[PDB]
Design a protein around this nucleic acid. Sequence first.
RNA 1: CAGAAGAAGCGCACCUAAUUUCGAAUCCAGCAUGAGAAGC
Lengths: 111, 235, 159, 161, 124, 199, 199, 199
Amino acid sequence: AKRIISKKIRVELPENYEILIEKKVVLNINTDNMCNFASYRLMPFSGFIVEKDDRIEINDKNWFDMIWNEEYALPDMSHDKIIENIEYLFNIKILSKNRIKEFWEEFCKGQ
Amino acid sequence: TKITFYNSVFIETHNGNYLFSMPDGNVDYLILDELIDYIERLKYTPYKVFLILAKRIISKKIRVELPKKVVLNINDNMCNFASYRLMPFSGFIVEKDDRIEINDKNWFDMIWNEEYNKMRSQIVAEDFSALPDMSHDKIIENIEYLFNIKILSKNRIKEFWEEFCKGQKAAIKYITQVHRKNPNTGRRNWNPPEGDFTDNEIEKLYETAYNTLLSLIKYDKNKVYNILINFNPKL
Amino acid sequence: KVVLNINTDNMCNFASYRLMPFSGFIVEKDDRIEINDKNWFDMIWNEEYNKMRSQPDMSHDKIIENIEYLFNIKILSKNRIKEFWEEFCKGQKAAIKYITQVHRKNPNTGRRNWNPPEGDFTDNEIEKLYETAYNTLLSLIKYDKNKVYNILINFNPKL
Amino acid sequence: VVLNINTDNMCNFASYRLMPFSGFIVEKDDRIEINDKNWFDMIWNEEYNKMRSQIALPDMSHDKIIENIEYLFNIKILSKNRIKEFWEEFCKGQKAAIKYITQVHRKNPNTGRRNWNPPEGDFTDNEIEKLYETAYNTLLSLIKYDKNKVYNILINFNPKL
Amino acid sequence: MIKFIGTGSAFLLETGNAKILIDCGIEQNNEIIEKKINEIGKADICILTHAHLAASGLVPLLVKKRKVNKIISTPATKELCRLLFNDFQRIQEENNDIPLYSYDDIESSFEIWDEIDDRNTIEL
Amino acid sequence: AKTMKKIYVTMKTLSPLYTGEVRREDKEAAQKRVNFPVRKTATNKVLIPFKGALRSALEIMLKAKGENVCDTGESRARPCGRCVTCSLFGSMGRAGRASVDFLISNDTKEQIVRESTHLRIERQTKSASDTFKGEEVIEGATFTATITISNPQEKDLSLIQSALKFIEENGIGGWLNKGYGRVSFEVKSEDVATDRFLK
Amino acid sequence: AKTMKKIYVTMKTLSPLYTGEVRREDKEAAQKRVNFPVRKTATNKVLIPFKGALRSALEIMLKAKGENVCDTGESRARPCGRCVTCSLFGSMGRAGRASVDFLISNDTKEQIVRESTHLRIERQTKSASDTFKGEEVIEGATFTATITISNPQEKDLSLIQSALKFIEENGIGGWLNKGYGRVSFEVKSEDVATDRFLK
Amino acid sequence: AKTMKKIYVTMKTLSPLYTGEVRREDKEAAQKRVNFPVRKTATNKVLIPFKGALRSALEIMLKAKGENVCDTGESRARPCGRCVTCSLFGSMGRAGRASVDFLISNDTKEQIVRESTHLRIERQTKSASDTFKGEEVIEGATFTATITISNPQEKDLSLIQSALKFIEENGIGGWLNKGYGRVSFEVKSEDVATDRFLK
RNA sequence: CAGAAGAAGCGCACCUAAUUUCGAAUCCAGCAUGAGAAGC
Ligand SMILES: [Zn+2]
Ligand SMILES: [Zn+2]
Ligand SMILES: [Zn+2]
Ligand SMILES: [Zn+2]
């Protein structure tokens, strides 16, 4: 604790017991031209939502534009090769619906 | 709100020890080369500094921010592209009385189906635009008997009148729908007769209700209203 | 020809077009395929529905005692005497019809359209007071107009 | 003004001919066009394709369609649940309706079973299979017709769908 | 907000819509452990860092008292904890002290047990 | 009259909730699709009447305690004007001192209203004899109200909280005998000055 | 009046239990994954209807005794308003004196609801012709309800207890003849005051 | 009606028994222990389907006898509603008079369930080609189920005992062809008044 | 810095997870009070 307070870092020991951080979502799109269709005040909008540290910011194409001008193991087989191989092994009954089910189950846990 | 002045206003609330521009206490928000040491002099390095300078102070391991209803996103697979984490999403912002929801195309498709079902089921053919025969007394007799036993009720007479205002054809549609014996359940939409009976008798009173209401649609509106107003005084 | 009677003010701009979802009624004419809103059809539904629908004996000294009692235990009121006097001025028949309407006990609920007596009355004394109101007002039916007005004017001074 | 809606399904309310509708007033260069939901689905695919980029149905006549749907409704193949779920997939787009009728008609390669409801009554196996193919062809022909006429065809067999 | 319960150690992080738990475990009195377990309340998730009994030992006790809906951990931490919980129950029963949970609590704890790897973002 | 008691009331549903639609046009339009519509605002929010529930609660509780409380509720009954319920809720003379707002949701019908299937089952055959659909409000739905007592007496918040416990125990509205309407209340009582707005 | 009976009813589930989802949105959401969803609250607890089971129980037993009871199981059958079942659970004239709550589980759906595979076997080839998935409540899961009887009478707890025994024998919920829904009921009754909340 | 036939059936296994687990979570929890888990309750007791073997037994023998009977084993079949098996066990609208409880054991899994090594042997090398581990219920295990028949008829006990003789000679559960499932049923039937719980 | 108790191998696969009926009926929609006062 003494060494990390020496690194200017606040530390709360468990023999003791405060700011309110709150991540917010910013529209950043102008909600003037807005109608009511089915008793809901709605607007179809095209945008590029961004997740910034501490803030989710919905952002119009103006955003992508500015950021566009600013900016600008496992083996390998083609997509059609994968579909053709799983098609053949499905009709040769090596790959089954249960094997594909558990491969999807383990792939949903990570790679 | 404990406020202290320095050569700097050090307001110390319970929501953070704010300081607009170095005290010896813990400082949470710094509302701010010469600039870097001032932050280095503060013990318990601040959570956020509200300011080229930002690039450097980010690399000094410090958070920055550079200067209504709650907005809730309902749409979530993003991508690294152009540095910032990001996704393409087209959607709909909706402005509720206490919130702003960010919905997608499935919500609008849902409310499109929910509105289209309301739209398509409001006008039913010739609204406000081969019937059997019965004497007026026989109509009075059968509607009175089927009002005493609970087949032709006040709600049935009311809903007869509302559809018969919308034309003869809508009234025939309503009467055919009420008399319809569903082949999967063997049941008509007539309210069942009160009093001890038998299924042949009950089916014949249902048939009597069908023929007496159908023989009333051929009559004039005023004559229909003056037959039914003796039973349901509203309509 | 096409006329848009729907208000064109509020319109979003998605996909570089000014689009707006509407839910209305496309309506035919001699040459006008007009798009008329929800309110227009509430106009024509109300218009068409409204168009298709629009097309005994007792003593006077005992009568005074009865209307006093029934005005003091609140069965007979200023409003009852008012509508009784209007129906009396529209005829004998309609006033008997109104007295019948008020006294009519609905078989489904067993409720008459009088005002309930206040006080610790049980069931059949309230029923006897309702019958008393029936026979008192229906005995007042046969009397001449001047006598009914002088009888009612003690209780409801407006009528 | 340029209506992009077929002006059919028009009832006669009193001395008035009209059509319940929901669409979009897409005000453009001088058109102020009235385009339906299919245009909005195209527009949504336009946007949700363009924005990402920065990172043969048979003809069967209408009266034969009512005749076949009626025959299949009385022999318990096109039940009210089938008409309801077909309507829910039809309002979700025609492609989802192709997917649903393909899924229900697909004779599973292992079991040999289709997902229709079995015919009630005496029918041979070849006859039952021809009835299942009739169900596929009739609903696949119903996918082409527009939303209003499909609602009129399906409302006479399922009153709540 | 975060509560530091710790006998047993645990980290309850009440978000405001859930009660997420970190490392319910006991390295070493059974009654005060049970009272301290009752002090946590119904938790939506019980996240396990590692498969040591200092951070996983009380997980079957939490499914005895039905205080956890899902026990997420790493796929190797789970398999480890199979052997770990049967060994802890073998030692506890073998010592003739009254078992703090049972083998059925072990089984049912692995009935609601999900498993994710590193760098896999769950949203619950 | 210098003070005003504001009781902010926050009601969370511990059960399905139903309160029927009273508006004839809205009821008919919804009865084309669901036989028992729930009461709804035009802003698509759920509205329970709250003054009658509180008044009925206080009338049965205060009649049980043996107090001088009349029975509004009997057919065309006249409030006496001398009870505590006539003081807090009104008589034919003076109005009620407590303005009881409707219990309006913070959520919209898409989020809290579900159409549910209810049955009548024949006893001997044990099969469905009747079927109907009813709109209900989900569990955990949060509703708000603000009771505003003008000329506040000292036993006014206690009676409101007692009525809130009675509404918790009997249910707020709708099919209360079937299990619907079981709720819980949170009471943010306060005492504001009447000249709060005059700056 | 002046007292209210409170029957605190605790179910322990002995066989598995199924009561299907009634809400159209929740059912249509779950029929993608499971062909027989279970009734579930929005706070993820299991919901069993209890008033109809207690009604139906008492109607069968009192019709078998010969005591006069109406039938409210027949299609659109008007309640009589004179029988003891009409006094306890309700008629069209007078409401039910017994306010039966919903049987709500003490535990969450991810702790007592399991998804199960059911079949139809061809009687001749002894081979699966149909496979469906259904959600069931596990055995030993505990449900709670309060039967809150206003205007108490003497035979209103015992008949309820009698009806509970019938629900112990026949079952509650669905799939009652395949063995689903055999349960045990434990009862704790108390005559709470009607003015208990008045502080 | 006025009576109800309660048939208490005690079944003793005369060979190993396998009824496979239907719950998803119980199978996925046991997939690293036993490849064929036994259907057990959450009270750790073995749960066997009983309605469905009785129906299949009665349908096969009544089809063999030539008496009119439908097949509720063919895929998505509709029970006719007229045959006797539709009376006892049910149809789509009339429901089963014979409420057939699950065969819950009298003991726990630790006493009756054992984990076993089953094999597939090559016919030309006489070698263990596949080894797979499955649970089974031991011999002598006792299971109990109560069949409660409402509206009792004359040929309802006799048909159920005939069906139980069919399950005695054919088997209950899975792996019936290998020798698994051979049992002995013992029946004690009694007619109870439907108003027996009133007191 | 946390648990620990005659050989050998194996302890895995596959299918199915759908279908259908019902979604109505009924009662109620009243009553009461106040119709004045004051300035220019
Ligand atoms: Zn460790
Ligand atoms: Zn009073
Ligand atoms: Zn009755
Ligand atoms: Zn049959």
